[model samples]
Target: KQQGELYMWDSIDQKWTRHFCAIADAKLSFSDDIEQTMEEDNPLGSLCRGILDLNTYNVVKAPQGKNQKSFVFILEPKQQGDPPVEFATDKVEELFEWFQSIREITWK
Candidate 1:
């Protein structure tokens, strides 16, 4: 199960918002599983809710500072003119492995 929570950038608010995002194999989809508590309290929690098509995006590494313990991963939209979404992780190695998994499935 490729499931975990991440702090997603909320462009509207110009701040990072806590999002429980997941990727399901059976459904062949990716989406934010917003908590019931958050759904009521923060409307921003619902901002990025939707099933993202894996084929529509690419995962690419971004520059990082030494010993930062964090790195950026850009969700680049294949379509021109669309801005890329930036995701950061404190667990850099784990994220690197996740990206490799995606590459193995997609590029193979």
Candidate 2:
């Protein structure tokens, strides 16, 4: 569950807070600020604001149009109560790539 990918920061400002993410040891971890996160020699070892068990979730594409630059998607949880995780990438090309890769892993 450990790898690297680009992240779109938040929904509002839209100036591209964008982030860096990595998966390792069946873990999906996230960090903030494009410059700071990218400079780290070990992106996951520290500086992660949050982490999710990559095996406990499912990846699905999010609905979108041309209004925004980045595309969005979700990591729906297997158990109830936990909120769905939303992720945005600069482009749709990587969106589906993430979706398929994660699905192949979490599913049989």
Candidate 3:
């Protein structure tokens, strides 16, 4: 149920882009268009940018130092070859909040 905007490092493009982040079930879905494209019916969907399956993906720690440590975290797939994606938030508290939220869902 956690949703918000954040900077997502695109795995393919190897660049950072602002994305709308949403958590539903065990998947964390992000889109480049926020929730604006939620109602489109096209089969070639573009609203969904990517997803981090908490069941198969994992949460990694952000940058280790204070230089780029503000509200940053990482997510890497557990059962695949995808590289870790770095995420950043507007506030450190919000960053930690996601940590708890993601951990809450993934923890058995």
Candidate 4:
């Protein structure tokens, strides 16, 4: 999951955190910092948040600011009320690889 540094949104800080994420079993796990666990009721820590069913998740490109060298990928739950996860990457191919890996597990 630690393929590269991913730019993730930090709601509390209103900034982006450059950290690696672990994608597995239809979930995206990330930390608030380099070494932190996302525990329940812990807004100041890390967390695993996403749809457990891959097919129910929506993946889209941020259309507007995308260019050859960089782009934004958005992942969201199929249902409302769940937070959307956004990732910015300079290597589109690598991002696609991550998507492919997860898709493979889900489709199998």
Candidate 5:
């Protein structure tokens, strides 16, 4: 396993499983974990770096391997950056909408 690339293994069934992010915030928890690893690069800092409303937008990172605590939410404004942003389900959807619009940009 190396830094940046997603880790995975195929079994007899040939089933592919992907890691998900773990919800994190000010809850008396360890700072270093899979969740923290995801933010190793903060690409989404421009939009979500300033806020983390646990009540609504929960910060999360996918568990590294089988460890639920070890997260990896590397999604951000770019494929590789620092300080990743973990948005709530709803908020994430809205951001996706914005991203789609950006991709759909055209010249008039």
Candidate 6:
């Protein structure tokens, strides 16, 4: 979803990396938004933003602040013979729908 909000880079620390992320609400948030989502034991939040290692199993937790939501996108190079799964684009939309769907169906 970084169709335009992307920058060109040769490599990450001179190593091969193909992933990036964006937050839907970082303007009115604090460090707690990221800190609370960590796993405490083996938390991987330090590298969850901007880019991440696609070869590892990482968890994406929702931001923990009022009106704070996050949108993350995962990408792998097509050179690796990987096709675009589009989960990044779809999940954000789903998150939006999820919030709306619950509002429509819930008693509250």
Which of the numbered candidates is closest to the native, going by highest lDDT? 3
lDDT of all predictions = 0.57, 0.67, 0.71, 0.61, 0.29, 0.30
Which model is ahead, 2 or 5, in terms of TM-score?
Answer: 2
Instruction: Give the alpha carbon lDDT tens digit for every residue of 75-100 in model 6.
Output: 33334554422222234564444334
Best by TM-score: 3
Report the lDDT of model 2 for residue 4. Answer: 59
lDDT of 4: 0.61
Model 6: how large is the Cα RMSD against the reference? 15.4
- Please provide, for model 5 over 1-108, each residue's C-alpha lDDT reduced to its tens digit, 9 standing for 90 to 100: 111212222234343232232223321111222343456764442322223222322222333422222322323333344444432212334334423332232110
- In order of appearance, the predictions have TM-scores of 0.66, 0.67, 0.73, 0.60, 0.19, 0.19
- What TM-score does structure 5 among the candidates reach? 0.19
Residue pairs of candidate 6 with colliding backbone atoms: none
Looking at candidate 4, the ten consecutive residues that score lowest on lDDT are: 32-41
Per-residue accuracy of model 1 over 4-106 as CA lDDT, tens digit each: 5654555676755455665654222323435544567765545346555556678787666222326656677788997766555557776776566555545
Candidate 3: which pairs clash?
A: none
TM-score of 6: 0.19
Clashes of each: 0, 5, 0, 2, 19, 0
Whichever of 2 and 3 has more TM-score, that candidate is 3
Ten residues in a row with the worst lDDT in model 1? 24-33
Candidate 5, residue 103: lDDT: 28
Show the lowest summed lDDT stretch of 10 residues, model 2. Answer: 8-17
Between candidates 4 and 5, the one scoring higher on TM-score is 4
Candidate 4 lDDT tens digits, 1-108: 434566776667776656666766666665455434443545655444422455667776666733322666766777888777777766767677766665565566
